[PDB]
Amino acid sequence: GIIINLDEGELCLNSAQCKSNCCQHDTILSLSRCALKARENSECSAFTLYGVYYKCPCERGLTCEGDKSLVGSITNTNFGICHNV
Amino acid sequence: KEVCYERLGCFSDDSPWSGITERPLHILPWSPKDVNTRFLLYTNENPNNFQEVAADSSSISGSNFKTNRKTRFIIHGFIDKGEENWLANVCKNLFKVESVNCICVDWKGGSRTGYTQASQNIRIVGAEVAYFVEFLQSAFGYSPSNVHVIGHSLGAHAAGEAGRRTNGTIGRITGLDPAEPCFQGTPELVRLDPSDAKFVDVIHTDGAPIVPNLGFGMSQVVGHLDFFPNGGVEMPGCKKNILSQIVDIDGIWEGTRDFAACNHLRSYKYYTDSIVNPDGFAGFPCASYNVFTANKCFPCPSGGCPQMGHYADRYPGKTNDVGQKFYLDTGDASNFARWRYKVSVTLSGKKVTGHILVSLFGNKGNSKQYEIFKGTLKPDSTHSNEFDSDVDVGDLQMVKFIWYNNVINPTLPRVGASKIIVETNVGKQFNFCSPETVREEVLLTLTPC
Numbered sequence: 006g007i008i009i010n011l012d013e014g015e016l017c018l019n020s021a022q023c024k025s026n027c028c029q030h031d032t033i034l035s036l037s038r039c040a041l042k043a044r045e046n047s048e049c050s051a052f053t054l055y056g057v058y059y060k061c062p063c064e065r066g067l068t069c070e071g072d073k074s075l076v077g078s079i080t081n082t083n084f085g086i087c088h089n090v
Numbered sequence: 091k092e093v094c095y096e097r098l099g100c101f102s103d104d105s106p107w108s109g110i111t112e113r114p115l116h117i118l119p120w121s122p123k124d125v126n127t128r129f130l131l132y133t134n135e136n137p138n139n140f141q142e143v144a145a146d147s148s149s150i151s152g153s154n155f156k157t158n159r160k161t162r163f164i165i166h167g168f169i170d171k172g173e174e175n176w177l178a179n180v181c182k183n184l185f186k187v188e189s190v191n192c193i194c195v196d197w198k199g200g201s202r203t204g205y206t207q208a209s210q211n212i213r214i215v216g217a218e219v220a221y222f223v224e225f226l227q228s229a230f231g232y233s234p235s236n237v238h239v240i241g242h243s244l245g246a247h248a249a250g251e252a253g254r255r256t257n258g259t260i261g262r263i264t265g266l267d268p269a270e271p272c273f274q275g276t277p278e279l280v281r282l283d284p285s286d287a288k289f290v291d292v293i294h295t296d297g298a299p300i301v302p303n304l305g306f307g308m309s310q311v312v313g314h315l316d317f318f319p320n321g322g323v324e325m326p327g328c329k330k331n332i333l334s335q336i337v338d339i340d341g342i343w344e345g346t347r348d349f350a351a352c353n354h355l356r357s358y359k360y361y362t363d364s365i366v367n368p369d370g371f372a373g374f375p376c377a378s379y380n381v382f383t384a385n386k387c388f389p390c391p392s393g394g395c396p397q398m399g400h401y402a403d404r405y406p407g408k409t410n411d412v413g414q415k416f417y418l419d420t421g422d423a424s425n426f427a428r429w430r431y432k433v434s435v436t437l438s439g440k441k442v443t444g445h446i447l448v449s450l451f452g453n454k455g456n457s458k459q460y461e462i463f464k465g466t467l468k469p470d471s472t473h474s475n476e477f478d479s480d481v482d483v484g485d486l487q488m489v490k491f492i493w494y495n496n497v498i499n500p501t502l503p504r505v506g507a508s509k510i511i512v513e514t515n516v517g518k519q520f521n522f523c524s525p526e527t528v529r530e531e532v533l534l535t536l537t538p539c
């Protein structure tokens with residue numbers, strides 16, 4: 006909390022705090038820590054407004070392809086896979 | 091002064107045991123009864139419940155101990171007990187790859203006291219283990235070459251005491267961050283050294299001076315093969331802030347231990363992973379660790395690199411010389427395994443300022459993008475860098491180049507990689523080519539050439 010430039014595995018409240026811009030947690034009721042962004046061909050999440058992810062956004066030049074829904078946005082579940090273009 | 095015990099012999103406070111710069115105090119070890127060394131057996135037959143055995147035919151006989159397979163003893167250090175999860179956690183991983191008699195040596199009766207007294211208590215424990223080994227030899231004709239003793243901290247020296255008494259006939263000892271105070275710089279009689287076992291391999295993870303740095307382990311080289319992962323002084327993932335160390339993914343207890351001595355405990359954490367990752371810990375022979383990170387000790391030499399950890403005994407030249415230093419980097423969290431590569435990118439396109447990244451694609455998968463260089467990106471210039479990948483990609487089929495910079499030029503430049511050469515740790519080279527160029531933040535896919 007109130008501490009910027011955090012490392013992976015360090016607890017966080019929001020992605021702004023993480024060097025890798027992804028504060029992540031696997032479930033709703035569980036602590037979130039800084040995690041690396043999704044590499045190509047693995048699971049990701051569409052950039053969000055909630056600050057944290059259940060899956061991280063992709064690395065540079067990569068697109069997280071998957072179904073993007075209105076429900077998926079409010080629920081932070083706009084999942085997909087990292088693809089080149 | 092001399093105090094003698096049945097079974098174990100005498101113990102004296104003569105030099106060098108006491109009365110020297112490193113060990114001034116004249117301390118004698120506690121009684122065998124007090125130290126209360128216990129042998130807790132685990133096997134493939136009994137992986138979750140320990141059968142407490144002892145150096146007596148009825149014990150070995152009534153129990154699951156099989157005389158036709160290796161035996162590995164695990165001795166803890168100061169404050170710990172043989173029932174600590176990390177110990178049994180090692181046997182359980184061993185059960186994943188071999189049939190074995192896993193023996194956890196508990197001596198909390200002597201480890202949960204003043205350190206100077208724990209350091210002396212170490213000799214009763216060594217004595218207890220050599221007694222048990224000689225017993226297995228005499229009683230069952232079991233060879234001490236089938237014996238492997240693993241010892242963490244103080245236990246590394248207790249393992250060395252147990253080897254002294256068996257005249258270096260035990261197969262091997264693995265010192266997991268041998269304690270420094272009261273042992274570094276002293277004579278071999280008093281500590282682990284290559285002569286205690288047929289082969290001695292050591293993992294160094296907390297070698298900073300005890301004062302003022304408080305590094306619990308030694309920097310001094312004490313075996314045949316001495317490994318210094320991450321340089322052997324500061325381990326990645328250790329310097330997290332207080333709240334994060336304590337509230338880490340493994341529960342409070344693990345977190346708390348790590349708050350207290352993360353680097354030090356990394357040695358057994360590394361060893362446990364190597365067991366199930368036989369090629370994940372290639373150590374590189376090198377003058378020092380700075381020369382290693384300076385990209386001057388790659389790839390593995392002819393004949394190979396020794397694997398740090400469990401598979402270090404598979405190394406052909408393990409006893410060719412003593413104190414051979416190897417370097418390597420690991421991960422900052424479980425599955426500490428890393429595979430080192432080297433990539434040489436020759437630039438094309440426009441001279442710009444930025445960071446260049448590369449990701450590898452092979453039969454077994456692909457990796458993260460790794461920064462190869464950052465600064466002035468001038469055409470036809472080549473830049474190399476070695477890095478530790480969290481995945482083994484196998485045979486390379488493709489490499490994707492990519493660059494970017496915090497300041498976007500109003501001209502919209504295009505930078506390319508005319509050639510990228512990937513070299514694996516065993517010396518295999520793959521070449522990739524491209525005539526194309528790309529805007530920043532667009533992957534340039536290079537194909538085999």
Ligand SMILES: CCCCCCCCO[C@@H]1O[C@H](CO)[C@@H](O)[C@H](O)[C@H]1O
Binds near residue numbers: 013014031040338
């Ligand atoms: C419900 C379970 C998920 C909660 C969030 C899990 C965050 C785990 O996170 C991981 O922790 C390690 C050390 O703690 C770091 O090395 C990893 O890089 C980090 O991402």
Ligand SMILES: CCCCCCCCO[C@@H]1O[C@H](CO)[C@@H](O)[C@H](O)[C@H]1O
Binds near residue numbers: 017018033035
């Ligand atoms: C005394 C602490 C109260 C304020 C702490 C707020 C943030 C605590 O941590 C939060 O816990 C939640 C459930 O464990 C997770 O969903 C959050 O992602 C996690 O960061």
Ligand SMILES: CCCCCCCCO[C@@H]1O[C@H](CO)[C@@H](O)[C@H](O)[C@H]1O
Binds near residue numbers: 169173174202343
């Ligand atoms: C050494 C004096 C205090 C010992 C620590 C007591 C509290 C932590 O104790 C630990 O609790 C954990 C959960 O049961 C277990 O994993 C450990 O085996 C147990 O010792």
Ligand SMILES: CCCCCCCCO[C@@H]1O[C@H](CO)[C@@H](O)[C@H](O)[C@H]1O
Binds near residue numbers: 424
């Ligand atoms: C996909 C596989 C993720 C494995 C992440 C590691 C899970 C927990 O295992 C390990 O336990 C130790 C306890 O102190 C820590 O030091 C390690 O770094 C931690 O990662």
Ligand SMILES: CCCCCCCCO[C@H]1O[C@H](CO)[C@@H](O)[C@H](O)[C@H]1O
Binds near residue numbers: 352
């Ligand atoms: C093992 C019994 C003695 C423990 C002494 C603990 C003294 C403080 O030391 C510890 O805390 C420091 C900060 O958290 C860490 O940086 C060190 O790596 C660790 O040794």
Ligand SMILES: *[P@@](=O)(CCCCCCCCCCC)OC
Binds near residue numbers: 166167205242
């Ligand atoms: P190893 O058995 C002990 C390594 C050296 C520790 C000495 C420190 C104890 C004195 C108090 C200072 C913190 O650890 C498991």
Ligand SMILES: [Ca+2]
Binds near residue numbers: 279280
């Ligand atoms: Ca010795």
